[PDB]
Structure formats: C-alpha cells, structure tokens
Amino acid sequence: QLSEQLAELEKRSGGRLGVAVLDTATGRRIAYRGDERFPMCSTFKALLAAAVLARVDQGKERLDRRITYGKEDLVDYSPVTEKHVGDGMTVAELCEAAITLSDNTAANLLLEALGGPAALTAFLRSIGDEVTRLDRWEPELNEAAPGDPRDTTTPAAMAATLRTLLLGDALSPASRQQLVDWLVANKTGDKRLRAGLPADWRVGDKTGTGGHGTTNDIAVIWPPGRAPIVVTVYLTESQVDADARDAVIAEVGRLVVEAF
C-alpha cells in the first residue's frame, strides 16, 4: 500500500521520485525506485562526516584538530566557514557546519583531509556499499544532470549505508551518537520530512538540493515507543517549484506516519 501511494505521489511531483524505508524493528524494507540512481547533492555530507569519525575511531584524526584556510578556499554557501577565515575551525566544528547548515566549504575542507572524493568512495566500498559514488567537489557535484552517474546513490543503498553507520557497529558508540546529534540538530530541513511528522517523533536528517529540480532528504526517525526507521527520499527532474518539491517530501513523511 505504501508503495502504491508513493506512485501516486510521484505523479503529483512532476518528476522522478525514489524512496526507501528500512524498519529496524522488523527488518522490513519498502522501496519505490529503490535501485535507480539519483544525485545525492548535499545528502553525501552525512557520509562524509561518518568517514571522518571512522578515522577518529582509528586514532588517525582528532576532533579538536584545527584546520586553517583562506578566502580563496571559500565556495558559495558557506554560512559558518566564511566567519572563520581568520581563526580556522576544528574538525568537529567543520562536521557540525557541514551537516547542520550544509556549509559547502566545510565539506571541501573535510574532503581534502580525507584524500578527496575517491577516498570517500573507497570508504563506502570498504563498508559494503557498492553503489554510492562521489566524483566531484563542491559546488559542481550538485549539477544533477539526468543520466549522469557521477555523485549518485540509490535510495536503497543509501538507506542500508545509513543503517550501518548510524545504527550498526561500523562506528564507535561515541562517533555514532555524535553523528546522530548533528543530524537531529539540522537547521535546513524544517519544510521537508520534518514538516510531515508529529512533534514528538525524534528525527535527524540531512537535506540536498541541486539542479534539474532536485530536492532530497535522508533521515533516521524514532517514533515514540519504538525502534527507529531509516527513510531516504530523492526527487529529481521535477517541474514543480521549489516549495512544491519540499511539500512532496513532507507528504512522504505523512505517509510514513500513517504506515507505522
């Protein structure tokens, strides 16, 4: 039934909609275009922060290490990093900026510390994700051209990878909890999945927005009294306006509430 409702929603969206719902209470998975590729845009930043924390767990990085940079490093939409060209920022501060405000420069600085898009992709392969790929830096990775496999995931692969990192044991308990805290404190997602959920549901999410009418949101959700549910939502090639695309993702949130 959720599957059939998602197909009707896709018609309303004017584009191509991909959704995966992974219920950790039961291991049940629901998907719509779950194995098709979609542009990640800034949803990749959640994976990026995870890869940095994996290095912290191994003793190869420190949360309090300070990274310095200049005006020449700034790309557009850098609300936090632009305020600190003078003093630099710690690794923790960059993770938080990248997740909670989608700071683009913070993402590039963290990517450079990792070894670049190829290093992030290699980390994903090492944890069993054979599908997701990062190829470019900010801001070009948000092009979101139809038929281009660069910088894409599938809704099912992204949901499995999030489950492993956020809820499994690939990260240490301190790293998992810190990453979840950053997602819960996200400031950019109020009009998307969150708009479709009751106030008492705990939700951590990361949005993405890009070219060709692309609007995404990935989330881990704890309904009251329950084990959590991972939801990934990718919408692209959409011909309705940006506010209507947000409303589409909020309606996916409402469908999930009805279903669980």
Tab-separated table of C-alpha atoms in Angstrom:
chain	number	residue	atom	x	y	z
A	1	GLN	CA	0.000	0.000	0.000
A	2	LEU	CA	2.773	2.482	0.872
A	3	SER	CA	4.314	1.534	-2.478
A	4	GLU	CA	1.068	2.369	-4.325
A	5	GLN	CA	0.646	5.689	-2.557
A	6	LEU	CA	4.209	6.651	-3.439
A	7	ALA	CA	3.445	6.080	-7.124
A	8	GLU	CA	0.500	8.468	-6.885
A	9	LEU	CA	2.677	10.969	-5.082
A	10	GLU	CA	5.252	10.777	-7.872
A	11	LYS	CA	2.603	11.877	-10.383
A	12	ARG	CA	1.947	14.965	-8.194
A	13	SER	CA	5.666	15.742	-8.027
A	14	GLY	CA	6.160	16.294	-11.742
A	15	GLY	CA	9.416	14.319	-11.652
A	16	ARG	CA	11.113	11.104	-10.660
A	17	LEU	CA	10.752	10.037	-7.017
A	18	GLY	CA	12.876	7.485	-5.184
A	19	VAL	CA	12.107	6.338	-1.651
A	20	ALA	CA	13.378	3.654	0.715
A	21	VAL	CA	12.057	2.861	4.175
A	22	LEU	CA	14.028	0.476	6.348
A	23	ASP	CA	12.287	-0.608	9.567
A	24	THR	CA	14.884	-1.663	12.103
A	25	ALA	CA	12.256	-3.187	14.438
A	26	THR	CA	11.356	-5.844	11.898
A	27	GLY	CA	13.970	-5.609	9.128
A	28	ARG	CA	11.161	-4.933	6.642
A	29	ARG	CA	12.088	-2.731	3.670
A	30	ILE	CA	9.736	-0.742	1.489
A	31	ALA	CA	11.046	0.925	-1.678
A	32	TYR	CA	9.899	2.820	-4.712
A	33	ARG	CA	12.517	3.086	-7.481
A	34	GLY	CA	14.824	1.798	-4.748
A	35	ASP	CA	17.547	0.639	-7.118
A	36	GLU	CA	17.552	3.602	-9.523
A	37	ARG	CA	20.344	6.156	-9.288
A	38	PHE	CA	19.679	9.690	-8.072
A	39	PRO	CA	22.004	12.678	-7.473
A	40	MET	CA	22.955	12.896	-3.822
A	41	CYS	CA	23.659	16.611	-3.681
A	42	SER	CA	24.332	17.545	-0.039
A	43	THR	CA	22.970	14.280	1.360
A	44	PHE	CA	26.531	12.957	0.880
A	45	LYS	CA	27.675	15.199	3.750
A	46	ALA	CA	26.274	12.727	6.278
A	47	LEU	CA	28.595	10.041	4.800
A	48	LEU	CA	31.481	12.452	4.772
A	49	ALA	CA	31.157	13.163	8.497
A	50	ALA	CA	30.978	9.402	9.124
A	51	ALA	CA	34.209	8.768	7.229
A	52	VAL	CA	35.983	11.464	9.286
A	53	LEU	CA	34.689	9.918	12.553
A	54	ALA	CA	35.863	6.474	11.400
A	55	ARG	CA	39.336	7.990	11.249
A	56	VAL	CA	38.909	9.443	14.721
A	57	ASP	CA	37.932	5.936	15.960
A	58	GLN	CA	41.177	4.520	14.479
A	59	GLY	CA	43.269	7.226	16.115
A	60	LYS	CA	44.157	8.747	12.713
A	61	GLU	CA	42.255	12.027	13.170
A	62	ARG	CA	41.278	14.236	16.146
A	63	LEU	CA	38.015	16.099	16.690
A	64	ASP	CA	39.891	19.045	18.175
A	65	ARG	CA	42.434	19.382	15.373
A	66	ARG	CA	42.359	22.896	13.907
A	67	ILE	CA	42.204	23.373	10.127
A	68	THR	CA	43.183	26.753	8.698
A	69	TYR	CA	42.110	28.144	5.348
A	70	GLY	CA	41.810	31.382	3.360
A	71	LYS	CA	39.271	33.416	1.402
A	72	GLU	CA	40.434	31.598	-1.712
A	73	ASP	CA	39.059	28.357	-0.305
A	74	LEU	CA	35.558	29.741	0.161
A	75	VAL	CA	32.903	28.498	-2.267
A	76	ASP	CA	29.349	29.805	-2.207
A	77	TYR	CA	27.004	28.908	0.625
A	78	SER	CA	29.483	28.851	3.450
A	79	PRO	CA	27.449	30.487	6.290
A	80	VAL	CA	29.762	29.206	9.034
A	81	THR	CA	33.225	28.890	7.426
A	82	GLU	CA	33.206	32.405	5.950
A	83	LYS	CA	33.117	33.769	9.522
A	84	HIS	CA	36.354	31.986	10.487
A	85	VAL	CA	38.842	32.549	7.673
A	86	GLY	CA	40.869	34.319	10.369
A	87	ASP	CA	40.962	31.725	13.160
A	88	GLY	CA	40.299	28.400	11.375
A	89	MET	CA	37.928	25.712	12.674
A	90	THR	CA	38.285	22.352	14.334
A	91	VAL	CA	37.383	19.086	12.634
A	92	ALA	CA	34.335	18.785	14.945
A	93	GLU	CA	33.212	22.320	14.059
A	94	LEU	CA	33.539	21.596	10.353
A	95	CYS	CA	31.462	18.393	10.669
A	96	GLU	CA	28.775	20.268	12.515
A	97	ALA	CA	28.738	23.135	9.982
A	98	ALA	CA	28.637	20.702	7.049
A	99	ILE	CA	25.702	18.741	8.497
A	100	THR	CA	23.536	21.278	10.312
A	101	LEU	CA	23.833	24.202	7.878
A	102	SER	CA	25.099	22.345	4.807
A	103	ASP	CA	28.204	24.546	4.709
A	104	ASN	CA	29.890	23.852	1.327
A	105	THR	CA	33.399	24.995	2.234
A	106	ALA	CA	33.354	22.866	5.359
A	107	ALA	CA	32.609	19.862	3.102
A	108	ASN	CA	35.517	20.662	0.764
A	109	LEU	CA	37.942	21.058	3.711
A	110	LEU	CA	36.872	17.743	5.206
A	111	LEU	CA	37.135	16.070	1.773
A	112	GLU	CA	40.693	17.357	1.433
A	113	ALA	CA	41.535	15.999	4.902
A	114	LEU	CA	40.159	12.587	3.751
A	115	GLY	CA	42.022	12.463	0.438
A	116	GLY	CA	39.196	13.659	-1.846
A	117	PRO	CA	36.029	12.174	-3.447
A	118	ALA	CA	37.870	8.949	-4.352
A	119	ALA	CA	38.844	8.405	-0.699
A	120	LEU	CA	35.242	8.885	0.437
A	121	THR	CA	34.092	6.440	-2.233
A	122	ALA	CA	36.726	3.939	-1.088
A	123	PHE	CA	35.483	4.219	2.489
A	124	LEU	CA	31.952	3.352	1.271
A	125	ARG	CA	33.246	0.314	-0.647
A	126	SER	CA	35.037	-0.808	2.488
A	127	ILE	CA	31.765	-0.893	4.480
A	128	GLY	CA	29.922	-2.817	1.825
A	129	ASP	CA	28.253	-0.066	-0.201
A	130	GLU	CA	28.983	-1.000	-3.816
A	131	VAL	CA	26.737	1.610	-5.363
A	132	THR	CA	27.206	5.106	-3.904
A	133	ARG	CA	29.887	7.249	-5.564
A	134	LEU	CA	31.326	10.688	-5.082
A	135	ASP	CA	33.257	12.088	-8.027
A	136	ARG	CA	33.374	15.884	-7.720
A	137	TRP	CA	33.841	18.677	-5.159
A	138	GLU	CA	31.509	21.467	-4.074
A	139	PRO	CA	29.747	23.113	-5.771
A	140	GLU	CA	29.929	21.142	-9.071
A	141	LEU	CA	28.693	17.856	-7.574
A	142	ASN	CA	25.208	19.387	-7.423
A	143	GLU	CA	24.783	19.532	-11.238
A	144	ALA	CA	22.315	16.604	-11.043
A	145	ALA	CA	22.156	16.007	-14.786
A	146	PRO	CA	19.794	13.176	-15.806
A	147	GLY	CA	21.660	10.049	-16.927
A	148	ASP	CA	24.952	11.143	-15.301
A	149	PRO	CA	26.175	8.538	-12.750
A	150	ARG	CA	28.611	10.916	-11.058
A	151	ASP	CA	27.829	11.786	-7.436
A	152	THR	CA	24.850	9.411	-7.190
A	153	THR	CA	23.409	6.781	-4.826
A	154	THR	CA	20.198	4.709	-4.923
A	155	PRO	CA	17.554	5.144	-2.266
A	156	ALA	CA	18.006	1.511	-1.083
A	157	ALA	CA	21.814	1.650	-0.952
A	158	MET	CA	21.789	4.961	0.918
A	159	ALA	CA	19.267	3.585	3.471
A	160	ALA	CA	21.431	0.454	4.094
A	161	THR	CA	24.600	2.518	4.394
A	162	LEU	CA	22.924	4.906	6.879
A	163	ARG	CA	21.695	1.950	8.916
A	164	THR	CA	25.217	0.508	9.104
A	165	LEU	CA	26.826	3.818	10.109
A	166	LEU	CA	24.197	5.340	12.369
A	167	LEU	CA	22.660	2.289	13.953
A	168	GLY	CA	25.142	-0.536	13.439
A	169	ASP	CA	28.668	-1.033	14.751
A	170	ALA	CA	30.828	0.350	11.926
A	171	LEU	CA	31.421	3.419	14.144
A	172	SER	CA	32.232	3.579	17.876
A	173	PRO	CA	29.342	4.409	20.191
A	174	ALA	CA	30.720	7.976	20.717
A	175	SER	CA	31.040	8.590	16.990
A	176	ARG	CA	27.541	7.172	16.194
A	177	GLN	CA	25.925	9.275	18.883
A	178	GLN	CA	27.760	12.466	17.874
A	179	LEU	CA	26.737	11.994	14.240
A	180	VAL	CA	23.119	11.384	15.197
A	181	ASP	CA	23.222	14.531	17.379
A	182	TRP	CA	24.368	16.612	14.386
A	183	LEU	CA	21.548	15.189	12.223
A	184	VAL	CA	18.955	15.834	14.955
A	185	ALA	CA	20.195	19.437	15.196
A	186	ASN	CA	19.847	20.013	11.432
A	187	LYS	CA	18.605	23.517	10.649
A	188	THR	CA	17.839	23.186	6.908
A	189	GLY	CA	15.084	20.558	6.856
A	190	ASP	CA	12.014	22.188	8.502
A	191	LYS	CA	9.961	22.247	5.294
A	192	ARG	CA	10.742	18.675	4.233
A	193	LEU	CA	10.313	15.331	6.077
A	194	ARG	CA	10.062	17.123	9.415
A	195	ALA	CA	7.007	19.082	8.246
A	196	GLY	CA	5.174	15.786	7.811
A	197	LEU	CA	5.915	14.300	11.250
A	198	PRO	CA	4.311	14.873	14.692
A	199	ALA	CA	6.272	16.993	17.155
A	200	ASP	CA	7.044	14.060	19.496
A	201	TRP	CA	8.793	11.995	16.801
A	202	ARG	CA	12.604	12.394	17.125
A	203	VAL	CA	14.167	12.977	13.689
A	204	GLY	CA	17.683	13.594	12.403
A	205	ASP	CA	18.017	14.491	8.735
A	206	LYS	CA	20.240	15.852	6.024
A	207	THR	CA	18.869	17.688	3.004
A	208	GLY	CA	20.199	18.079	-0.519
A	209	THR	CA	19.197	20.498	-3.233
A	210	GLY	CA	20.506	20.736	-6.799
A	211	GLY	CA	19.974	21.342	-10.491
A	212	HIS	CA	17.218	19.826	-12.649
A	213	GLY	CA	14.614	20.240	-9.903
A	214	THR	CA	16.403	18.053	-7.356
A	215	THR	CA	15.247	18.049	-3.752
A	216	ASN	CA	16.313	15.332	-1.319
A	217	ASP	CA	16.084	14.471	2.334
A	218	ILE	CA	17.547	11.473	4.234
A	219	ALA	CA	16.546	10.703	7.804
A	220	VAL	CA	16.589	8.459	10.795
A	221	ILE	CA	13.343	8.650	12.771
A	222	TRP	CA	12.325	7.371	16.236
A	223	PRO	CA	8.560	7.183	16.601
A	224	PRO	CA	7.537	7.099	20.281
A	225	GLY	CA	7.844	3.732	21.987
A	226	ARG	CA	9.639	2.181	19.047
A	227	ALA	CA	12.852	1.155	17.298
A	228	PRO	CA	13.958	3.616	14.606
A	229	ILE	CA	13.105	3.811	10.866
A	230	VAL	CA	15.577	4.967	8.147
A	231	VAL	CA	13.939	6.948	5.344
A	232	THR	CA	15.622	8.172	2.167
A	233	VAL	CA	13.822	10.424	-0.280
A	234	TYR	CA	15.210	11.547	-3.620
A	235	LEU	CA	13.265	13.719	-6.036
A	236	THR	CA	14.697	14.856	-9.328
A	237	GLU	CA	13.773	16.107	-12.810
A	238	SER	CA	10.875	17.818	-11.153
A	239	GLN	CA	8.970	20.593	-12.932
A	240	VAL	CA	7.025	21.988	-9.976
A	241	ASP	CA	8.589	24.830	-7.996
A	242	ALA	CA	10.940	24.528	-5.020
A	243	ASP	CA	8.178	24.966	-2.396
A	244	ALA	CA	6.050	22.280	-4.039
A	245	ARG	CA	9.047	19.883	-4.117
A	246	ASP	CA	9.502	20.429	-0.347
A	247	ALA	CA	5.782	19.688	0.137
A	248	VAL	CA	6.212	16.408	-1.767
A	249	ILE	CA	8.869	15.261	0.720
A	250	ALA	CA	6.708	16.406	3.673
A	251	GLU	CA	3.900	14.211	2.260
A	252	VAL	CA	6.264	11.227	2.225
A	253	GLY	CA	6.704	11.962	5.945
A	254	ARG	CA	2.893	11.874	6.441
A	255	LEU	CA	2.658	8.550	4.556
A	256	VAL	CA	5.314	7.055	6.806
A	257	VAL	CA	3.416	8.182	9.932
A	258	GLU	CA	0.263	6.530	8.577
A	259	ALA	CA	2.170	3.340	7.824
A	260	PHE	CA	3.939	2.959	11.228
